[PDB]
Design a protein around this ligand. Structure first.
Ligand code: GNP
Ligand code: MG
Lengths: 171, 145
């Protein structure tokens, strides 16, 4: 009943909004309460792209360091990886370098990588300028969006853009 | 959201009701099919018009059965998915209980229990993943003519 199965993966520090970004994509809702992800999880969402029904299996990792060895066993299967930081949390963005190194180490060499600066609704409390995000994406030659799971800004666009990059190299 | 515990239970009851309806309908369909195929063979002699109306009725029965059987196959996988999701939710709550207790107050047996529940939780996610891979291999299989 579906044509293709794509495996996606969200990584980044705890508290940047990884689970919320996924919940907005898969249920068009937002929950303000912080419920920290334990270990690893995944959700299913089917989308239609270029006349194809694509089944997205979206893996959601725990950002807390105690769960690190658990999360690293799920990198190798991923076809696309969203690296997520929080635009109001300076250290979440400085840690993007380390998360990129984990992908270098544990993930398939041809994985699609995409950088998301989440919580873009808190401009008043921004610490990370949009241009730093833009510049680090350019240095690694990857896409970058600033997102908000609360206000539903660029959530659908990020996921479908990454799915189209996987699809474009599928044959 | 404990909304999701109640939603998962209601979806499970709903699917069970539909499964019971499909099982009854396939039973009826197979009896009707047996009857018409006895008619076609016994009346090896009757009007060709009535024979082709009977073969027409067995062809509509054939498509209705395929539809029902394929719907049933999808629902049976969904039942097992909801069953795994409910077990995963049960371990999540137990482990969240262990983790919200002060570490000063945890015995060695408590910490070993907490680790065991974590390993069972991860394995339940892997079981849910194996169900995804079962569906993928059936999709590849069903495309083969
Ligand atoms: N204002 C605002 N808050 C957000 C946004 N996205 C998430 N949050 C909030 O930030 C907190 C962390 O969200 P969560 O999705 O659990 O982050 P996480 O990356 O999954 N953390 P973990 O790795 O520990 O599971 C929550 O309280 C959530 O409501 C957003 O776009 N805007
Ligand atoms: Mg989370």
């Amino acid at each position: 009943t579906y044509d293709l199965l794509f495996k996606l993966l969200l990584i980044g520090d705890s508290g940047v909004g990884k689970t919320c970004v996924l919940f907005r994509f898969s249920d068009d809702a937002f929950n303000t309460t912080f419920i920290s992800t334990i270990g690893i999880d995944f959700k299913i969402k089917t989308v239609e792209l270029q006349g194809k029904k694509i089944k997205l299996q979206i893996w959601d990792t725990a950002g807390q360091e105690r769960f690190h060895t658990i999360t690293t066993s799920y990198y190798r299967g991923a076809m696309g990886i969203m690296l997520v930081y929080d635009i109001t949390n300076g250290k979440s963005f400085e840690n993007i370098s380390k998360w990129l190194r984990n992908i270098d180490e544990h993930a398939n060499e041809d994985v699609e990588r995409m950088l998301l600066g989440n919580k873009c609704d808190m401009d008043d409390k921004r610490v990370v300028p949009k241009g730093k995000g833009e510049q680090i994406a350019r240095e690694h030659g990857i896409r970058f969006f600033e997102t908000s799971a609360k206000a539903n800004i660029n959530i659908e666009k990020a996921f479908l853009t990454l799915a189209e990059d996987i699809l474009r190299k599928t044959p | 959201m404990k909304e999701e515990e109640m939603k998962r239970f209601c979806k499970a009851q709903t699917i069970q009701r539909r499964l019971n309806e499909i099982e009854a309908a396939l039973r009826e369909l197979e009896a009707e099919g047996v009857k018409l195929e006895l008619a076609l063979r016994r009346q090896s002699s009757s009007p060709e018009q009535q024979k082709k109306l009977w073969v027409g009725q067995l062809l509509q029965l054939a498509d209705k059965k395929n539809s029902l059987v394929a719907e049933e196959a999808e629902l049976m996988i969904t039942v097992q998915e909801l069953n795994l999701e409910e077990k995963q939710w049960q371990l999540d709550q137990e482990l969240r209980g262990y983790m919200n207790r002060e570490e000063n107050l945890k015995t060695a047996a408590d910490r070993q229990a907490e680790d065991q529940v974590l390993r069972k939780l991860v394995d339940l996610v892997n079981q849910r993943d194996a169900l995804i891979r079962f569906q993928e291999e059936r999709r590849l299989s069903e495309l083969a003519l």
